[PDB]
């Protein structure tokens, strides 16, 4: 909500810190004719973004 | 003196880290507007009234 650029509707706040994005917040879903599919953000196997 | 700081890369990587426009809008009501795509859209800062 805070660190989304203002054009995408967010506040676009600049962060001089260390804020972790929980992995559960990097998943979305899309509905196509075959059904509803789910996507994650990164193939990288690292800590939370 | 010119512009002594560039935020293009910072905002680029902030959009990238959040999973991109797709994930960011998944966090929002964008898919609830049934807009076919995110390209040909614009905001309006204030209403007519």
């Amino acid at each position: 909500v805070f660190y989304t650029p203002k054009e995408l509707g967010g506040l676009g706040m600049l962060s001089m810190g260390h804020v972790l994005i929980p992995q559960s917040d990097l998943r979305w879903s899309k509905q196509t004719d075959v059904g509803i599919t789910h996507f994650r953000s990164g193939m990288s196997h690292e800590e939370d973004q | 003196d010119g512009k002594l700081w560039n935020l293009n890369n910072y905002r680029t990587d902030m959009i990238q880290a959040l999973g991109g426009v797709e994930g960011i809008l998944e966090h929002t009501l964008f898919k609830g507007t049934y807009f076919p795509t995110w390209e040909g859209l614009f905001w309006e800062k204030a209403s007519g009234f």
């Binding site: 810190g17 260390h18 804020v19 939370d48 | 890369n9």
Partner: peptide, 22 residues
């Protein structure tokens, strides 16, 4: 995952300031 901002003192000293910028 708390949503609070963490102080980066004692953190990310493996990175410079001129990195991630062209």
């Amino acid at each position: 995952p708390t949503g609070e901002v963490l102080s980066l003192v004692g953190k990310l000293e493996g990175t410079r300031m001129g990195d991630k910028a062209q």
